[PDB]
Ligand binder design. Structure first.
Ligand code: ZN
Length: 257
């Protein structure tokens, strides 16, 4: 198999007699295939930064051992230049403790695995506009700082209503330094959707949010070159191309009336 860095894969395996799926020492969780009762699924993601060049997954059965080899592809990401406030790429010392806390809080949330579906069928795009800055663009801020784009930016004037991409439970709903006013939703199975730089937040941490329900209004909070919506997906432990993830998720989990 081959996978572009920064993307996720849905691996399909036989359910009968399955014992465990591992990458080196780490167990990869599994969930049921919603249509094919003979299959299970797992999410495998490659990080954009510093992925391994090759991966060997091992699936253990009562009477089989299966090695799956996935080659990391570099993809065809392009570069872009962005102008932001100098303090948003070199923050003052008075603020770096808050940045430390916020990163520790998020790490704790993304490691909190929910082993059931909190979603309801397919994801919707949370904004009906167009892409202004695609995933994985190699960035330079102020001709000083290299970065990469860990989500996808949609055109949005300040105050555009932002709706939940799928059903889930709110895990973050507060102003953070770099992401601005941030909303993060746990959808189960380690899938989290993220909405950044909002001007207003309409939910609270712990809330059960339904697909298509209002979660806030877009804005220009945090590290921005101007007003927009930033949409992100974390799955399989990593930030992945959100619209690629949604297409792959929806092929499996979409429903009909
Ligand atoms: Zn963005």
């Amino acid at each position: 198999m081959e996978l572009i860095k920064g993307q996720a894969l849905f691996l399909e395996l036989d359910k009968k007699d399955f014992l465990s799926l591992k990458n080196n020492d780490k167990n990869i969780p599994t969930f049921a295939h919603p249509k094919n009762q003979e299959k299970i699924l797992a999410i495998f993601s490659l990080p954009y930064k510093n992925p391994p060049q090759n991966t060997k997954l091992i699936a253990f059965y009562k009477d089989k051992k299966e090695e799956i080899f996935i080659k990391t592809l570099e993809g065809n990401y392009k570069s872009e230049k962005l102008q932001v406030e100098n303090k948003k790429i070199f923050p003052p010392k008075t603020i770096q403790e808050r940045i430390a806390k916020e990163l520790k809080e998020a790490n704790a949330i993304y490691s909190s695995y929910t082993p059931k579906a909190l979603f309801n069928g397919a994801f919707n795009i949370p904004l009906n506009s167009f892409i202004t800055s695609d995933f994985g663009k190699a960035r330079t801020f102020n001709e000083k700082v290299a970065s990469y784009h860990s989500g996808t930016d949609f055109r949005a004037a300040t105050g555009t209503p932002i709706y939940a991409a799928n059903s889930g439970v709110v895990k973050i709903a507060k102003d953070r330094y770099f992401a601005g006013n941030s909303v993060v939703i746990d959808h189960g199975f380690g899938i989290y959707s993220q909405y950044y730089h909002l001007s207003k937040i309409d939910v609270k941490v712990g809330q059960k949010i339904k697909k298509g329900e209002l979660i806030g209004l877009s804005g220009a909070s945090g590290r921005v070159s101007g007003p927009h919506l930033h949409f992100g997906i974390l799955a399989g432990g990593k930030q992945v191309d959100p619209l690629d993830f949604v297409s792959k998720f929806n092929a499996i989990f979409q429903l009909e009336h």
